[model samples]
Target: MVLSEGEWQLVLHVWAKVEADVAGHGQDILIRLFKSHPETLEKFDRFKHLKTEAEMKASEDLKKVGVRVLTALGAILKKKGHHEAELKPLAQSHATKHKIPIKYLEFISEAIIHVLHSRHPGNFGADAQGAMNKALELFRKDIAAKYKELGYQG
Candidate 1:
């Protein structure tokens, strides 16, 4: 789905703020993911033992990885659907190397929307939500295709 100009503006506006504090916001979203979907934590050996938010907050490795993932997301947000190719390698690696399940990608989307809504409660209306969903759907589709190519059944 193509996001309208107004929807794109809303996404970019909120993301600009998110990019400014990638580490903090990234950690927040990751923590939400682990909390809301404990099954995701099992994939990361380092994160598996760190259940509580305080433990996750204190983990330097988690912070570093969170920043990396969030930075990549920031790059994709900048493209506004024009750079699906840029996302392919990352998706392939996650599926083949990291052995990340496709369902976890959906979990991550939920985490992101939850964080976005919490951070910009008044600003994130229906249009912005729709835009976010479209963007995430594109990302998920690309990733799932790559996952299938790598011989994974999702």
Candidate 2:
């Protein structure tokens, strides 16, 4: 969905709120994703052995990574139309260094939307969801292209 000026503004507004509370909600989102999809944990060497939410929550590395991820997402939102300029490098690293597949990226996108909606039940509405979905699709597509260029079959 192409977000209009007002929708873009709304997205930015909501994202600011989410980032402000990232310390709590950001970690929770990752925890939920890992718990719901155990295989996803295998992608993260640091978190691969973590078996419980309590173990994850107690992890300083997990918290730091969550903050970085949320911060990058906030930067992408701030750049909106110019997202590739910000996301491309990160995507390249993720694809080449981390060897993360497009499917995992897609899973993260879904997890992000789910977490946002769950955290701000009344505040995160359809427009917000649409904007995020569109943004993530663009991000994932760019990342996947880089992965393909790097000879990733998946």
Candidate 3:
């Protein structure tokens, strides 16, 4: 789904604030994801141990992944459209290569909402939330479809 013009404007405007501390926000989102859903570690990859809140907070690897995700999502949000073709490689790897379950998408999305709301509570007003929520929904659909295509049913 395409973001309406106003939603695009709102998202872009709010993202600027997040860009100020991208690393912090990114890591928080990652930490939140693991904290909220430790079961994700069973499927994502190795480096599964030593993931306590303190350990995760100090983890360089987790920081790297978090920063990567935030920057990637920022870039994705900046551009227009669903970006199906652009995300093909990520979808393929996560779905087929990594064999991650499709059901786990919710944990990460919830992490995003929690972190953004906690960090910048005022920025994501109703309209901003709506835009971001829709964007994530579309993003989820794109990734989930790839999992289905790769023969993972969820």
Candidate 4:
């Protein structure tokens, strides 16, 4: 998905606020995902056993997923072009190799919103919030498009 110039700047604005906290803030978002929708963990071996927020927070696998995701986002954000290509491979792998359900993908957007809004209450103005939402909408659409391309229902 392509982002407008203003859209790109707005996303980078929110991202810059927590850039240094990449892995750390990511962990918060992911843990919130698991907490908000624990069933989403049933698809993964590494996270299925986590029974508490503490366990999730301490999970290296979860942390890796967190870092991987935000790092990928950072990579795309560095440019202001059609970066949907960046996420296509990830979606293909999840759709074909991992067989991640699309709903799990949807839940991540929720967790991201919940985690960021709560953690940095002072940082996210209405513009920042709207920008984040727009960026994520494109992210989800790009990923979902790939999933659909693979004919993956799960």
Candidate 5:
């Protein structure tokens, strides 16, 4: 299902928390997420904190890319699907905006994994990556459909 604006805002806010300090804030965010959406805890075993100091440090470098991705997503929403194809362009621009490689998608993915791992530890394992990738693909199709419905791409 598509996430509501509040849910998206929560994710973005929690993401900002993580980037600010890869420490205790992640745990707080996880708790808040589960409290707000208990059902997600089933999908993502959310109560474990598995991030070591070293792992947190490693994730710090990718935070900018993560924020840029969210910003692009925000812009897409703000445009009311009018510039839907711009998702690709936004992704491309994100690479330059953050001074990262095009392959920074991996870093973005890894940051997501980091969040999941910190929140759910061993529960997520390898499957979280695929699940996330699948979710993004589905959301992309949804956004495209929204654009099509509005006849905005012409």
Candidate 6:
């Protein structure tokens, strides 16, 4: 599932292109993820309730981190392979940290693919599909690595 350097570049290029097309696409991506995976709503208290501008801004700041991290992870996944077992602990820890459920990671991953398809349908032709499959494998590897690095015992 390891992608060639060229394929990784293509993935990154697509991500950058999408980001440029929509300045806040990263945040939008996360927002859409939560919407699509409503179960993820419990992950953040802020998302569980509407807040004042100040509180809302704080929530946005936190979500922005999620956007950046997840976006970067997507690129990593494109180069890595599926390592769901490795990611399990991290997912559990993340859910525990925010008083949510580990299943949110699954939702997030699904949402990421959804975003890619929705944003660049034409670009994902046959050749791109092969590359994307490789990229997805990479992503799984990345998830495993991140979980291990993050000290996710659960």
Winning candidate number (TM-score): 1
Residue-pair clashes, model 6: 10
Candidate 6 residue runs with Cα over 4 Å from true position: 21-23, 50-67, 74-103, 145-154
Candidate 5, run of 10 with poorest lDDT: 43-52
The regions of model 1 sitting more than 4 angstroms off are: none
The parts of candidate 4 lying over 4 Å away from their true place are none
The reply for model 2, stretches above 4 Å from the true place, is none
TM-score against truth, every candidate: 0.91, 0.89, 0.90, 0.88, 0.32, 0.60
Q: Of models 1 and 3, which has the larger TM-score? A: 1
Q: Which model, 2 or 4, shows the larger lDDT?
A: 2
What would the TM-score be for candidate 1 when compared with the true structure? 0.91
Q: Give the Å shift of residue 7 in candidate 6.
A: 2.7
Instruction: Kindly provide the TM-score of model 3 when superposed on the true structure, using C-alpha atoms.
Output: 0.90
- What is the Cα-based lDDT of residue 99 in candidate 6? 38
Better of 2 and 5 by TM-score: 2
Worst 10 residues of 6 by lDDT: 50-59
Query: What tens digits encode model 2's per-residue C-alpha lDDT throughout 76-152?
Result: 77876676577667867786788777888778888888998988867689977887777778777766776677677
User: What are the clashing pairs of model 6?
Assistant: 77-138, 77-139, 78-135, 80-137, 80-138, 81-137, 81-138, 81-141, 82-140, 83-140
True-vs-predicted CA distance for residue 100, candidate 6, Å:
7.4
Better of 4 and 6 by TM-score: 4
lDDT of 1 at 55: 94
CA RMSD, predictions in order: 1.5, 1.8, 1.7, 1.9, 13.0, 5.6
As for candidate 5, its clashing pairs are: none
lDDT of 3 by residue, 41-110 (tens): 6664644885578888888887787788888888777775657666788788777677766567777878
